[PDB]
Amino acid sequence: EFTYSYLFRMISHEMKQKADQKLEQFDITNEQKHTLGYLYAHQQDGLTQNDIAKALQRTGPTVSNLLRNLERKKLIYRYVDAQDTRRKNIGLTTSGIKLVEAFTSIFDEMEQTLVSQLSEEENEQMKANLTKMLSSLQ
Amino acid sequence: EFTYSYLFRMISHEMKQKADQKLEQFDITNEQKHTLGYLYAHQQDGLTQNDIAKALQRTGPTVSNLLRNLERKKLIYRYVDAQDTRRKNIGLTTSGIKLVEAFTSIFDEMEQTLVSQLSEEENEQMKANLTKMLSSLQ
Numbered sequence: 001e002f003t004y005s006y007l008f009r010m011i012s013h014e015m016k017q018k019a020d021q022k023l024e025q026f027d028i029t030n031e032q033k034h035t036l037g038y039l040y041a042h043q044q045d046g047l048t049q050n051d052i053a054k055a056l057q058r059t060g061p062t063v064s065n066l067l068r069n070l071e072r073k074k075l076i077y078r079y080v081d082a083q084d085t086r087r088k089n090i091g092l093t094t095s096g097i098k099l100v101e102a103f104t105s106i107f108d109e110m111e112q113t114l115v116s117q118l119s120e121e122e123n124e125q126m127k128a129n130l131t132k133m134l135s136s137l138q
Numbered sequence: 139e140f141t142y143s144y145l146f147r148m149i150s151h152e153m154k155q156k157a158d159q160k161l162e163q164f165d166i167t168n169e170q171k172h173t174l175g176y177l178y179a180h181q182q183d184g185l186t187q188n189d190i191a192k193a194l195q196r197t198g199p200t201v202s203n204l205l206r207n208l209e210r211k212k213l214i215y216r217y218v219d220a221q222d223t224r225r226k227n228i229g230l231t232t233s234g235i236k237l238v239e240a241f242t243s244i245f246d247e248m249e250q251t252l253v254s255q256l257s258e259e260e261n262e263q264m265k266a267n268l269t270k271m272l273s274s275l276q
Contacts (some may be wrong), residue, residue: 011146
């Protein structure tokens, strides 16, 4: 019916689509998730908009628009940099951190939804056989 | 045990690397391969650069450049459409036809090599399960 090439390509595509759908249930886009995640990981010393734009490889306007959107929801905050007052640093809020932590539910729920399609034995057989297939491609 | 997410992602990644490797003998990029195959399947319809860019979901300048590359190799040619001279249609030369058939054979062989990793019963179950999981993801 279908080739493996087709099945794996479509599964890759649909996994990405489903993760995006689940992320949009938090009213978050992929770009926004990456922004929040960047702050979560890298805010310890104080980040400016320019730092964020350079790290994400996006334009100033894109980053400015992203941050305004997130700030309306109180997911990010700003504070003046006392040794460079021409610059604001951008931080992730307590609620922004909780939301980023909640994103992990997406991968987990997706995996459990796949596992639930099969019996425990069928899952073990399928993973063993996928592992064979993977090994042959390496 | 690994997750399905991990296994599917890695299988797709390794498929991509192996397909890229096998493509090297043909001296074409993945975009060029897609273009040639699209022409093979649809040139009878009278295809322009714009039709190709839309099918590929790539930008105009990228597609124009790719077509010049294929044309220097004499894999494709163009002809003005007498019913609409604003349009140049694209066709495969005989070498373009032969090249598509050659790489199709190689990729068909790659698929059969993957099938050969599992027994008949294992393949039947694997295709059935992958089909169900693809369905679960909508």
